[PDB]
Amino acid sequence: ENTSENRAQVAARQHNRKIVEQYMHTRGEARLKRHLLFTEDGVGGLWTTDSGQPIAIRGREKLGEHAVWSLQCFPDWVWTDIQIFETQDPNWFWVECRGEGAIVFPGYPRGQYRNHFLHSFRFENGLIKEQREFMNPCEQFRSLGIEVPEVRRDGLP
Amino acid sequence: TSENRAQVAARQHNRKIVEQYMHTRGEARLKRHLLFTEDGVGGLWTTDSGQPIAIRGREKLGEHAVWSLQCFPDWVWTDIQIFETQDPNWFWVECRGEGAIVFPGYPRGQYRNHFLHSFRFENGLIKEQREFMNPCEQFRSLGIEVPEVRRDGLPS
Ligand SMILES: O=C(O)c1cc(Br)ccc1N[C@@H]1CCCNC1
Ligand SMILES: O=C(O)c1cc(Br)ccc1N[C@@H]1CCCNC1
């Protein structure tokens, strides 16, 4: 129904969505300002690593700093095939996408990195309170020339 | 408008199927394949090989739940959160999962992971289920050495 509360919810959902879209389409130099889409105490980072522990960057300044490292390590990164999922929580979105670009990590040769990604975005007062990325670390190993372990699955149909 | 009332109906029905899927345990896992369409696809989208292990069709889903009940004999999903989307036929689930892993040729272990699941529906049944996790936790549960990525310059 058309109550003012459901209008507020819809309003917020619409503003939050535009922030998700902006985050996902940010490229090149503007990547250095993306930290401004987060709350002061916002957290962003990679939730699927080889260690099994999240790489979580806490706070806007730290996100700012890490965006510099990221521009060096992924100089031409683009997100593609982007699909945004709104949820029953107007402050929570998921995104399913791909990504591609050069990977330049010290200690390895320069490679082409492609992966499939899920992102979680949680909001608070119109800014990102928590962003989390989920991907398959095995595709990153390949991109870096690191040997991928294989599971035998004997007697799988 | 009854378009939105059909949609809301579709969403609430599909959501109960997602709940049932997620809370199925023990022997009832032999019958979960019945929640799928006949042509339905289920499986693991994050593998070491980079290709999905997709199990196509209701009958095959059934047979692969037999294998799965030997490999993961006491598996349970926990800390379940269901996300509805703007599409009444598309849901996401964030959860944990754990239990014994018992694969041929590897030492028995205890597997635990963090999981995302995508469920897409058709006529109130599951047309496509996809699981996404971190394969490195599965390696670890199997005694398989996990390489370490060096991230130099990484700040704090
Ligand atoms: O793209 C950015 O500006 C960026 C900023 C921060 Br801060 C952390 C990582 C970033 N990019 C990586 C590229 C490879 C896939 N994961 C995300
Ligand atoms: O739990 C089931 O009944 C099941 C049925 C099918 Br057919 C395939 C895999 C199954 N379970 C595993 C548990 C370990 C984490 N990924 C999914």
Side-chain angles (χ1 to χ4, degrees), chain A residues 3 5 9 11 21 28 39 44 46 58 64 71 73 75 79 83 95 99 113 121 124 140-141 144:
Chain A
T3 55
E5 276 277 69
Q9 275 206 53
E21 299 228 51
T39 52
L46 171 68
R58 299 163 194 286
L71 202 53
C73 295
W79 301 110
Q83 282 185 277
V95 180
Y113 177 38
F121 294 91
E124 176 172 291
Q140 186 167 64
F141 302 155
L144 290 173

Side-chain angles (χ1 to χ4, degrees), chain A residues 47-60 62-113:
Chain A
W47 258 244
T48 44
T49 55
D50 72 72
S51 79
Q53 283 326 295
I55 297 173
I57 310 126
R58 299 163 194 286
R60 225 187 227 150
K62 267 94 198 99
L63 274 168
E65 286 171 5
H66 183 84
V68 175
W69 173 87
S70 200
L71 202 53
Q72 302 172 165
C73 295
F74 304 102
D76 67 351
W77 192 255
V78 305
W79 301 110
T80 63
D81 299 285
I82 285 148
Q83 282 185 277
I84 299 177
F85 302 96
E86 297 169 10
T87 77
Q88 75 278 22
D89 184 336
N91 290 306
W92 205 328
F93 290 71
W94 291 83
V95 180
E96 174 170 4
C97 68
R98 299 220 162 245
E100 190 170 310
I103 187 170
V104 187
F105 273 20
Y108 307 87
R110 185 183 165 89
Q112 189 73 11
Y113 177 38

Side-chain angles (χ1 to χ4, degrees), chain B residues 37-69 71-110:
Chain B
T37 59
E38 217 68 27
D39 58 20
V41 182
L44 184 61
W45 253 242
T46 49
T47 60
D48 59 60
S49 79
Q51 297 306 315
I53 307 307
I55 317 136
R56 300 177 179 279
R58 199 192 266 182
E59 229 157 350
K60 298 235 209 191
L61 285 161
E63 296 160 359
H64 184 97
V66 189
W67 171 85
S68 177
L69 193 58
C71 291
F72 299 107
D74 58 359
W75 190 254
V76 301
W77 303 108
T78 61
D79 302 275
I80 300 174
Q81 321 173 66
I82 301 159
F83 301 88
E84 295 173 3
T85 71
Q86 69 274 35
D87 176 346
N89 296 324
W90 207 324
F91 294 69
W92 291 87
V93 176
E94 177 178 17
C95 71
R96 297 310 180 123
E98 68 176 83
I101 184 163
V102 190
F103 278 11
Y106 298 92
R108 168 179 336 257
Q110 179 78 8

